Amino acid sequence: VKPNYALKFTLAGHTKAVSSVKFSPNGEWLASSSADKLIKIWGAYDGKFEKTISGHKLGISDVAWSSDSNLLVSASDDKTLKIWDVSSGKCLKTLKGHSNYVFCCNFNPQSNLIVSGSFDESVRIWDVKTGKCLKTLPAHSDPVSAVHFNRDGSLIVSSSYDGLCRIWDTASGQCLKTLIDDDNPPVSFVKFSPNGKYILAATLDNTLKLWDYSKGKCLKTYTGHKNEKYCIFANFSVTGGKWIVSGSEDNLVYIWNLQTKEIVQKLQGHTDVVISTACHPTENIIASAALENDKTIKLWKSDC
Amino acid sequence: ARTKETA
Numbered sequence: 183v184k185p186n187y188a189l190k191f192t193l194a195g196h197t198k199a200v201s202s203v204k205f206s207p208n209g210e211w212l213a214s215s216s217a218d219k220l221i222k223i224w225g226a227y228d229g230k231f232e233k234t235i236s237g238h239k240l241g242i243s244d245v246a247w248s249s250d251s252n253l254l255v256s257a258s259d260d261k262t263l264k265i266w267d268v269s270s271g272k273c274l275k276t277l278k279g280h281s282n283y284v285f286c287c288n289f290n291p292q293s294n295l296i297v298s299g300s301f302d303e304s305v306r307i308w309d310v311k312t313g314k315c316l317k318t319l320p321a322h323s324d325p326v327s328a329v330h331f332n333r334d335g336s337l338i339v340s341s342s343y344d345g346l347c348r349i350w351d352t353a354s355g356q357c358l359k360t361l362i363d364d365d366n367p368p369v370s371f372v373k374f375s376p377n378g379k380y381i382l383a384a385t386l387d388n389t390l391k392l393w394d395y396s397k398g399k400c401l402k403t404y405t406g407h408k409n410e411k412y413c414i415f416a417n418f419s420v421t422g423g424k425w426i427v428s429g430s431e432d433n434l435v436y437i438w439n440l441q442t443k444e445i446v447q448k449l450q451g452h453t454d455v456v457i458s459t460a461c462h463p464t465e466n467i468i469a470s471a472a473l474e475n476d477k478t479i480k481l482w483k484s485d486c
Numbered sequence: 487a488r489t490k491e492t493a
């Protein structure tokens with residue numbers, strides 16, 4: 183069985199490359215961040231522009247939703263994160279502490295903490311309520327490309343241009359695992375699987391890998407796309423068939439069968455590198471976002 | 487930002 187994602191909507195409004203798209207956990211909204219320093223909110227089902235959230239002084243590399251779909255956190259070249267009340271558009275807190283560009287961010291599932299990664303080679307853990315830094319992890323020896331909490335929030339996974347994925351105890355800050363395969367390409371993305379058993383890691387050698395982190399073993403490789411340059415997001419699609427989804431530097435969205443590793447679909451339409459994809463929590467909907475020559479977000483829907 | 491950022 184293969185999906186049949188078809189283009190439904192093209193979303194225009196960002197004035198520069200879109201960096202990240204994310205669906206609200208409640209399925210109502212899409213959030214986009216851009217090099218234009220703006221966050222935009224869109225209807226998840228019709229792509230209808232909702233509003234613009236402004237305040238960062240430089241470009242934004244990432245945005246993430248709180249568990250209850252009420253807050254966003256954004257990571258900016260201005261070396262801050264900002265916590266946003268989506269309904270009021272207010273910046274609740276500006277998180278200062280990184281010494282270089284903030285590249286990546288996520289809430290824990292309980293959305294009382296934020297984790298951030300930076301060009302300063304550190305991972306920071308922040309208290310959402312106070313907007314104060316709880317912990318600074320000397321995580322990596324090169325920029326941190328991605329950070330993610332596991333299912334219960336007790337672990338963080340980080341990835342870096344230093345070629346390493348690391349697993350951290352949230353509470354203690356201790357490094358519990360270093361993961362690397364038989365080469366040392368920059369790691370451009372990582373996240374835990376929904377069931378919390380696996381990490382999915384992108385490397386800048388055109389490869390995605392599914393790891394059992396507790397066993398420290400590479401279980402599955404996904405190849406056939408182009409990824410040698412940019413920090414491209416990857417996703418688990420779980421609403422229909424069990425897929426892996428990634429953008430690609432050939433301007434396509436790639437979809438793989440998670441179990442068999444075969445390509446099941448390539449989505450054509452963008453005019454530049456697809457930097458970001460996101461999978462809707464309840465419907466077979468993919469959002470995709472592309473770089474400076476395109477500046478659009480696309481919404482794709484499948485029967486399965 | 488991510489949109490031009492390389493290794």
Ligand SMILES: *NCCc1c[nH]c2ccc(O)cc12
Pocket residue numbers: 282301325490491492493
């Ligand atoms: N993405 C900008 C180029 C690059 C690669 N590695 C880096 C470390 C620090 C820094 O300020 C820029 C940078």
